[PDB]
Amino acid sequence: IIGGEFTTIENQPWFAAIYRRHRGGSVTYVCGGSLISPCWVISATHCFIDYPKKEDYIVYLGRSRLNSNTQGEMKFEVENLILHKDYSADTLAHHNDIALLKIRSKEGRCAQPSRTIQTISLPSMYNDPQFGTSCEITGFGKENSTDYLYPEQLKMTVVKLISHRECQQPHYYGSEVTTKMLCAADPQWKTDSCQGDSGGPLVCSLQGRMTLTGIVSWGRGCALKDKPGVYTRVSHFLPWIRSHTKE
Numbered sequence: 001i002i003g004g005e006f007t008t009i010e011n012q013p014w015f016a017a018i019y020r021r022h023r024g025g026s027v028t029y030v031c032g033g034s035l036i037s038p039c040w041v042i043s044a045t046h047c048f049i050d051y052p053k054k055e056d057y058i059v060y061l062g063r064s065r066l067n068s069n070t071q072g073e074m075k076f077e078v079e080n081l082i083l084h085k086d087y088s089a090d091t092l093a094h095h096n097d098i099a100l101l102k103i104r105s106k107e108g109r110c111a112q113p114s115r116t117i118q119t120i121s122l123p124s125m126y127n128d129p130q131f132g133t134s135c136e137i138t139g140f141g142k143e144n145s146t147d148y149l150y151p152e153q154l155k156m157t158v159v160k161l162i163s164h165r166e167c168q169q170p171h172y173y174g175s176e177v178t179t180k181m182l183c184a185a186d187p188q189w190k191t192d193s194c195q196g197d198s199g200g201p202l203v204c205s206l207q208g209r210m211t212l213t214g215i216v217s218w219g220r221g222c223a224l225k226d227k228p229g230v231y232t233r234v235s236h237f238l239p240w241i242r243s244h245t246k247e
C-alpha cells in the first residue's frame with residue numbers, strides 16, 4: 001500500500017495472509033485474501049498459477065504482522081485450492097483473477113469467530129457501488145515502487161471507484177480493462193495498492209453494509225497519474241463462487 005496508514009487486524013478482521021512453504025525450510029509471503037465464510041478464503045489466481053500445490057500453502061487469520069506472531073492468530077492448511085480455469089494474463093490485464101482456498105486447522109476445523117477473525121459479506125448480483133464511492137484496501141504490499149522489501153505492519157488506505165468509461169480512456173488503460181474489472185484510485189494519485197497487495201480486499205460500504213467489492217489484481221506501476229489500480233469485480237463471479245463452495 002502506497003501512502004495510507006498502518007492498521008491492526010482488529011480493524012480488518014476478514015483479512016487473510018497467505019504464505020508459501022519452501023524447499024529449504026523458510027516461509028515467504030505470497031498474497032492477501034479475505035475470509036468469506038468459516039471455511040473459505042477468496043484471493044487471486046495469479047498468486048498460485050505457477051505453484052498449484054495446495055500443500056505448499058499456509059493461511060493465517062488474525063495476523064497483524066508479516067514476520068511475527070499476533071495474539072489470537074490462527075494457522076490453517078489448504079484443503080482445496082480452486083483456481084479459475086479461464087485465467088489469462090495479457091500485456092497488462094489479468095483476466096478471471098480470482099481463486100478460492102478451502103482452509104482447515106490441523107484438528108480439521110474451520111475458522112472460529114473472534115474480535116480479530118470475522119467474515120466479510122459478498123455483494124448481490126450485479127449490484128456494485130456507484131462510481132465515485134470511497135472504498136478501502138488492505139495489504140502487506142510495497143510502500144514504494146522502488147522498495148524490494150514489504151512492510152512489517154499491515155497497512156490500509158482509501159480509494160475511490162472510477163467508472164468503466166473513464167478507465168477505458170486512451171491515457172488510462174484503453175480496451176485492456178473489461179466490465180469484469182473495477183478501477184479505483186486516489187483523486188490526487190497519492191495512495192494506491194502495489195506489488196504484494198495482490199489477492200487483498202477492496203471493501204465498500206453498500207447500504208450501510210461492508211461488502212467485498214473487489215480483489216487486488218493489477219495495474220501499471222503504483223500511484224502513477226491516470227494509472228488506477230484494477231480489481232476483479234467480485235459481483236460478476238458469484239455463480240462461479242457458489243458452484244465451487246457447495247460440495
Ligand SMILES: C[C@H](NC(=O)[C@@H](CO)NS(=O)(=O)Cc1ccccc1)C(=O)NCc1ccc(NC(=N)N)cc1
Pocket residue numbers: 046089091092093094145192193194195196197198216217218219220221222223224227228229230
Ligand atoms: C501480477 C500483477 N501484475 C501487474 O500488475 C503488472 C501487469 O501485468 N503491472 S506492473 O509490473 O506495473 C506491477 C508492478 C508495479 C510496481 C512494481 C512491480 C510490479 C501485479 O503485480 N499485481 C499486483 C499489483 C496491483 C496493482 C498495482 N498497481 C496499481 N494499483 N496502480 C501494482 C501491483
